[PDB]
Amino acid sequence: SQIPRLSAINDLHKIWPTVEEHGAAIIESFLSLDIVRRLNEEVDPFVKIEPIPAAKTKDHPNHVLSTTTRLVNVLAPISKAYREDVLNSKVLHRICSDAFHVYGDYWVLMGAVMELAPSNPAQPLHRDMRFSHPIVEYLKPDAPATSINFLVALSPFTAENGATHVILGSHKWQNLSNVSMDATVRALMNPGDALLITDSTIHCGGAETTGTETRRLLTITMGISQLTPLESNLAVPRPVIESLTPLAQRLLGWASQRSAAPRDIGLLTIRGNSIEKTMNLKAEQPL
Amino acid sequence: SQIPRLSAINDLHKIWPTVEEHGAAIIESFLSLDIVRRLNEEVDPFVKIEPIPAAKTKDHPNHVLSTTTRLVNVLAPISKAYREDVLNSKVLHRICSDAFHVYGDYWVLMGAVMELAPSNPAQPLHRDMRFSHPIVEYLKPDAPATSINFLVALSPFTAENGATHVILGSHKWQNLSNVSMDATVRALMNPGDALLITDSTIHCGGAETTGTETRRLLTITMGISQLTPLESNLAVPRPVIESLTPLAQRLLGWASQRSAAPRDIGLLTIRGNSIEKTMNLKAEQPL
Ligand SMILES: COc1ccc(/C=C2/C(=O)Nc3ccccc3C(=O)N2C)cc1
Ligand SMILES: COc1ccc(/C=C2/C(=O)Nc3ccccc3C(=O)N2C)cc1
Ligand SMILES: O=C(O)CCC(=O)C(=O)O
Ligand SMILES: O=C(O)CCC(=O)C(=O)O
Ligand code: NI
């Protein structure tokens, strides 16, 4: 059985339910090729600069990602297309509100562009959040997902060039004795298509076997506002933050957050008042 | 059986173990009367101003606390004694590192001064974090505490003036059919003494029965850096933040955080670098 494929527009209401059941779904045309085109140009440089994940100058080195991997996060000040189009995506917000209504508000735990060099090896089968949020390992096995991961194709995803592997149903697995590449199916996708998975879905990047092609993706980890992001937007110029929608500002942590609790007392408040009120934060001011 | 009483200095090593077993411990002389004296003077005004918890002008009103309650959080810019002495307390840090080593780094989820007016009613028996972090309700019942609460007496705590009630052992209770005021004991404390409880310890503020006395306390909720604080320090003047120790800065969220995971990739990082590095953040610069 292959990964369910759904229309971003016509099947929007079916997307989260499908992921809730199977643990994965391909969203066809999640982003328009226009947005993909612009985003690829805006991050195009920043990919080639980034040192090796475990670079000596980095004070928080990533010792897990392969040396043939390049990751660039904190995209707001880099990409207009990201901070305007992606962070206000009607599809992304309908899915996230469907997934996280039991917990309350959500934000970006990490938005990053990943580029795999040719002959990049397959990643080991894994669950996300294990190198950042140990707490997730202590949740009851039937606890609803506290984070989801949109893996958006910025280049063609094929069997040969290392398209993502997933084990359908693996988000409900307590016993991991069955975990093997034998149990996986491939996320074959065009640029703008998105693989949506949960923090419990067992998956891995495929092997780049062409020796010529470079695979690029935008990974958006959306999580509940009760969990700390992997990335900080604190250093983002205030003119850039004031150029965003109020909703985009909230996703980057430049706003107070609410829990779903009946009499919610809130998160990141200042004596009963919000970040954005206290600091007189403007919205949608052009640069 | 009464709440175990321990010396902050001589019994430091026994404090967390005692709380781990019984769910509560009185730390005698947690703060020196000097620090208590200064703190009481520095917050003295801010207590009397604060509107009712559910004030109309507040965009995050607190609908839970009684109208005869006054709470003031974000103490860093208010109190020198707080941001210098309390946030660098050797006792607090030994306890927190003992409690949270399995999860990793910790910070202040909320530091607040609470003042109860005379004839203030007793709070209902409760567990903390239920109006902010629903996720805590989805943790396995044997999961180690992800937050603890230091309730520091800034005025004498007596049976008559509404000293805190606790049910010893209640942090391990799955079945809550036994919960009643009949099962509680009192936290009788002098100024500078601290009641330490977990997020699972069932407790409540006592009834102020004198009709004359005002009870004041400093509540410090210390939690793992994977959970979002209730309070934001984002609006704190940068000169004030640069006047703090690096450790104090981390506790207020003006630094990147680390998980206990073997190959930790970190929290609130900026392309492999920390907040404090990226923004050229100084430490211990006098005002
Ligand atoms: C080679 O084996 C791996 C390498 C990485 C992971 C998983 C993670 C992770 O938990 N979170 C994210 C989320 C988005 C993008 C990257 C990462 C990441 O870097 N790590 C460490 C697993 C297995
Ligand atoms: C009258 O009944 C109550 C009122 C409050 C709580 C509990 C909380 C809470 O979960 N967290 C804190 C932590 C420190 C200080 C105050 C609070 C607070 O305001 N609330 C809402 C319970 C029961
Ligand atoms: O490259 C991929 O398709 C998977 C990436 C991933 O799962 C990860 O980096 O955690
Ligand atoms: O006033 C007290 O002693 C208890 C306060 C408290 O538990 C609370 O506000 O949550
Ligand atoms: Ni992954």
Ligand code: NI
């Ligand atoms: Ni309480």
